[PDB]
Design a binder for this molecule. Structure first.
Ligand SMILES: Cn1c(O)c(C(=O)NCC(=O)O)c(=O)n(C)c1=O
Ligand SMILES: [Mn+2]
Length: 221
């Protein structure tokens, strides 16, 4: 669908009502699988980190490591389709501007490409932006074809604030996810027993980001 119809008829109302929004089949099989090929290419050539240190053993060779990451601008060689994903995200947000809460989005981070190795590691419950660092919207794109959470785990579990319930989101291929980055959406990644790829971008509210600068940019006189 065109960025605008999806943004105006589905994403905006869904975010303002629930603070979470799931869009399936965002780019199609062709583009999605190309992005998967680029991400897997980055992983195979060692562009990722060794992984988040989960359990630090007194013996170093026993240290267990979890999610691996790499920051992608989208202009790198062999990342053109990732850059196209980021451009499409940016189009959606552009068409949403002024309608997502009271936020005026004026920037974003680079793309955090994450790979859970499938060694039973996940990601602890957390809030993305708990201290007003300027990020208002989390946007995640998943790449895992034929994912069976009953078999592979890796579910994203969100605990919407005030609501006695949690929302389970499987990291499905060609799935796009939006949710408020602040304390409204604490969330965790449940242990993944299969390789789990995702691409996250965070969008900045102009006012919050502007006053985060003093919350921490100097000029010699
Ligand atoms: C700061 N940070 C996160 O907030 C992640 C996160 O919330 N992922 C949700 C999901 O993949 O469904 C994450 O995965 N990684 C690697 C990370 O570094
Ligand atoms: Mn998170």
């Amino acid at each position: 669908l065109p960025a605008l119809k999806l943004a105006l008829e589905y994403i905006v109302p869904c975010m303002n009502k629930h603070g979470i929004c799931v869009v399936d089949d965002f780019l199609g099989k062709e583009t999605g699988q190309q992005i998967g090929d680029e991400v897997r290419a980055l992983h195979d050539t060692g562009k990722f980190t060794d992984g988040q240190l989960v359990s630090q053993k007194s013996d170093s060779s026993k240290d267990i490591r979890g999610d691996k990451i790499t920051w992608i601008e989208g202009k790198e060689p062999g990342c053109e389709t990732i850059g196209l994903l980021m451009s499409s995200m940016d189009d959606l947000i552009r068409h949403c501007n002024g309608k997502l809460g009271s936020y005026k989005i004026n920037g974003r981070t680079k793309a955090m490409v994450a790979c859970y190795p499938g060694n039973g590691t996940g990601y602890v419950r957390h809030v993305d932006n708990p201290n007003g660092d300027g990020r208002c919207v989390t946007c995640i794109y998943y790449l895992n074809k034929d994912w069976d959470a009953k078999v592979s785990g890796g579910i994203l579990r969100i605990f919407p604030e005030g609501k006695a319930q949690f929302a389970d989101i499987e990291p499905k291929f060609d799935r796009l996810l939006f949710f408020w980055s602040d304390r409204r959406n604490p969330h965790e990644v449940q242990p993944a027993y299969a390789t789990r790829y995702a691409i996250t971008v965070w969008y900045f509210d102009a006012d919050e980001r502007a006053r985060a600068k003093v919350k921490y940019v100097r000029v010699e006189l």
